Amino acid sequence: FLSLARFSDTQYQRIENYMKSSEFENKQALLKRAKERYTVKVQRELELDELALRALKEDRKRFLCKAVENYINCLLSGEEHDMWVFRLCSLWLENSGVSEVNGMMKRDGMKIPTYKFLPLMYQLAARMGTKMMGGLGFHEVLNNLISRISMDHPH
Amino acid sequence: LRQDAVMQQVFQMCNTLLQRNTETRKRKLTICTYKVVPLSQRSGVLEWCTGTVPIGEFLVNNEDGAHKRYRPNDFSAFQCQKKMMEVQKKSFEEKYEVFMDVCQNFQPVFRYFCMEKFLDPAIWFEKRLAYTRSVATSSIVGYILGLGDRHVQNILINEQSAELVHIDLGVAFEQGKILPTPETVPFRLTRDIVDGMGITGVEGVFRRCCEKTMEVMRNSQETLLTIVEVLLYDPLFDWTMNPLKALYLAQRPSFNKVAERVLMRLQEKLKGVEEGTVLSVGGQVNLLIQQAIDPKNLSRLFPGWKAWV
Amino acid sequence: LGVAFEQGKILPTPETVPFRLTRDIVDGMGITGVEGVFRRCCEKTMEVMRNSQETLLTIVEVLLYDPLFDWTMNPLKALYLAQRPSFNKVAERVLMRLQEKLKGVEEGTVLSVGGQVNLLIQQAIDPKNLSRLFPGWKAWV
Ligand SMILES: Nc1ncnc2c1ncn2[C@@H]1O[C@H](COP(=O)(O)OP(=O)(O)NP(=O)(O)O)[C@@H](O)[C@H]1O
Numbered sequence: 001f002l003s004l005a006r007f008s009d010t011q012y013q014r015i016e017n018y019m020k021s022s023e024f025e026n027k028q029a030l031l032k033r034a035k036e037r038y039t040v041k042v043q044r045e046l047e048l049d050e051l052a053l054r055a056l057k058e059d060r061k062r063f064l065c066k067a068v069e070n071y072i073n074c075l076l077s078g079e080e081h082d083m084w085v086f087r088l089c090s091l092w093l094e095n096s097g098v099s100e101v102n103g104m105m106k107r108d109g110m111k112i113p114t115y116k117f118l119p120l121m122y123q124l125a126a127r128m129g130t131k132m133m134g135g136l137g138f139h140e141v142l143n144n145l146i147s148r149i150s151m152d153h154p155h
Numbered sequence: 156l157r158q159d160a161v162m163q164q165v166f167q168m169c170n171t172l173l174q175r176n177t178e179t180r181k182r183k184l185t186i187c188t189y190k191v192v193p194l195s196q197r198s199g200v201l202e203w204c205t206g207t208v209p210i211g212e213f214l215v216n217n218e219d220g221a222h223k224r225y226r227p228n229d230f231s232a233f234q235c236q237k238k239m240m241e242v243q244k245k246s247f248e249e250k251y252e253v254f255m256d257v258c259q260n261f262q263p264v265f266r267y268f269c270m271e272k273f274l275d276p277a278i279w280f281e282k283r284l285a286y287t288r289s290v291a292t293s294s295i296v297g298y299i300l301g302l303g304d305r306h307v308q309n310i311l312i313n314e315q316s317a318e319l320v321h322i323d324l325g326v327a328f329e330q331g332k333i334l335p336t337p338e339t340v341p342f343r344l345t346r347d348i349v350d351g352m353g354i355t356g357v358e359g360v361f362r363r364c365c366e367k368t369m370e371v372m373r374n375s376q377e378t379l380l381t382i383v384e385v386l387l388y389d390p391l392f393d394w395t396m397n398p399l400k401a402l403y404l405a406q407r408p409s410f411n412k413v414a415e416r417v418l419m420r421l422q423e424k425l426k427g428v429e430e431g432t433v434l435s436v437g438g439q440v441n442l443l444i445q446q447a448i449d450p451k452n453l454s455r456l457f458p459g460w461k462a463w464v
Numbered sequence: 465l466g467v468a469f470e471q472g473k474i475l476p477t478p479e480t481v482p483f484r485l486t487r488d489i490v491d492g493m494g495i496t497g498v499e500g501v502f503r504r505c506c507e508k509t510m511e512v513m514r515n516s517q518e519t520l521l522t523i524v525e526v527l528l529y530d531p532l533f534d535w536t537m538n539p540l541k542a543l544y545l546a547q548r549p550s551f552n553k554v555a556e557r558v559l560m561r562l563q564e565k566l567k568g569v570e571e572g573t574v575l576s577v578g579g580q581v582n583l584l585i586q587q588a589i590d591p592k593n594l595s596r597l598f599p600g601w602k603a604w605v
């Protein structure tokens with residue numbers, strides 16, 4: 001599980017780095033300056049670029065979901081790699097808007113023993129909120145997870 | 156024609172660097188160069204490579220192409236070109252399955268170039284070895300300089316010496332990735348190119364020569380970076396990509412920040428840094444070979460580049 | 465430990481030493497000085513840090529995005545430390561600087577564990593760097 005999680009995270013990180021890379025900004029800036037016969041070629045490029053963008057976004061979402069699932073499974077399958085809970089939380093906090101990630105944390109992350117989340121308890125508590133309550137919301141899952149951890153280790 | 160002349164000198168510097176190293180001088184790893192003499196901002200004159208024929212003219216010629224002569228039952232060059240253009244405005248998965256279908260009915264026949272021109276086994280082996288060394292040396296140097304638009308009509312092969320000659324060097328420094336159809340391959344290593352290397356393929360002479368060339372490039376990083384720095388700050392060197400050039404290249408029927416980014420990208424290449432990690436010469440060469448021969452990357456490429464060829 | 469992540473270099477008097485290795489610190493190590501146990505232990509510690517670069521980088525990433533973690537310097541804090549009678553780009557730059565430290569990159573070149581340790585020891589014990597420092601740090605001590 002850990003090996004698949006590391007590779008899936010690496011692929012997701014590479015895609016994320018490409019999106020924030022200066023090369024991507026330069027390529028995007030070329031199309032914006034180009035759009036400012038002539039109109040036919042311009043409207044095509046504004047269609048292929050978004051077609052490439054949606055495919056890249058879908059690939060990033062698939063890699064992110066697979067990495068999160070494998071990280072949860074690795075945590076549930078042993079204790080030697082408990083330190084990787086930081087990566088699982090880092091993906092979860094930075095992608096709180098994804099419904100799939102929040103659902104997997106609610107369905108499978110609640111089976112993870114609470115004592116693994118104690119070392120990073122400060123950051124989990126600092127992300128508590130109310131504006132985005134919901135059944136699949138990040139805040140409700142975070143609140144339920146934080147409460148459950150406080151159940152086992154109040155001290 | 157000034158841009159071509161500038162690229163020729165870098166090839167001379169790459170040739171000069173390769174000559175002074177015993178590892179590459181023994182293998183005679185050199186780059187074919189032709190004199191370019193610009194005469195104005197609009198017209199110029201350049202050397203004509205006598206005894207050379209385009210690889211596309213030899214392979215996929217409509218009348219007497221290599222594919223037609225050796226594989227009459229396979230798909231014609233026109234048929235493969237038409238199919239790729241149809242799937243251009245389609246999904247990526249549809250593009251991939253079309254590319255595999257075309258490649259299934261299009262087998263490389265480029266290995267016959269040396270067989271029909273050099274009947275003597277001793278001469279044939281020498282020409283094939285020279286061809287493999289020429290491709291390996293040009294691919295590594297082209298990757299280092301970010302050479303792009305390496306389609307069939309931009310590559311010349313010498314009939315007498317079987318050495319590849321690269322022309323139309325206007326696109327460089329990874330400006331090909333900025334095109335509407337990005338260049339996802341560092342160099343051209345299609346099935347025809349690999350097929351002409353022998354039964355061993357990329358393994359053997361090609362891989363060792365690529366590693367030896369990369370070691371020379373890595374060992375001369377301070378020299379190579381300095382030369383490119385001089386070029387990138389030339390006021391008359393219009394190496395940056397513009398919409399007019401981008402649309403012309405792919406047609407169908409702050410300067411300082413960019414130069415610094417290119418220099419940084421060149422520097423990480425010379426140190427073996429590809430995705431933020433340090434890679435050895437062997438590891439970097441393997442990554443470059445894998446990326447060039449990856450069918451998925453070839454599917455995304457422009458049909459005019461003739462990835463299937 | 466309020467000051468971290470090279471935020472001391474942003475101070476009006478920059479911190480030119482990675483750590484405190486003054487004459488008193490070296491003198492207490494014995495006649496051998498930095499050579500021997502100190503140098504080997506520093507190399508062993510650096511190897512562990514390098515071997516766990518992905519782990520260390522992941523942890524710091526969680527810390528730097530904490531909304532309540534006020535690790536960045538402000539003019540009020542800078543004057544308080546030295547007194548006499550976009551957050552995202554700042555977060556990313558520290559991560560990149562931390563990443564190059566974990567991989568041995570110091571001035572754009574790849575340095576081994578032994579080479580990196582030697583550079584750190586030389587910088588800390590360099591008298592020229594100690595002279596520029598704030599006397600309240602007591603470099604001579
Ligand atoms: N230096 C050369 N030596 C031999 N043949 C050459 C040389 N340069 C071009 N050719 C031939 O000319 C053909 C056309 O290429 P070229 O002269 O570059 O015009 P082009 O295709 O329009 N390039 P460009 O003007 O940049 O779009 C090639 O396929 C070669 O057969």
Ligand SMILES: [Mg+2]
Nearest residue numbers: 308309322323
């Ligand atoms: Mg051409």
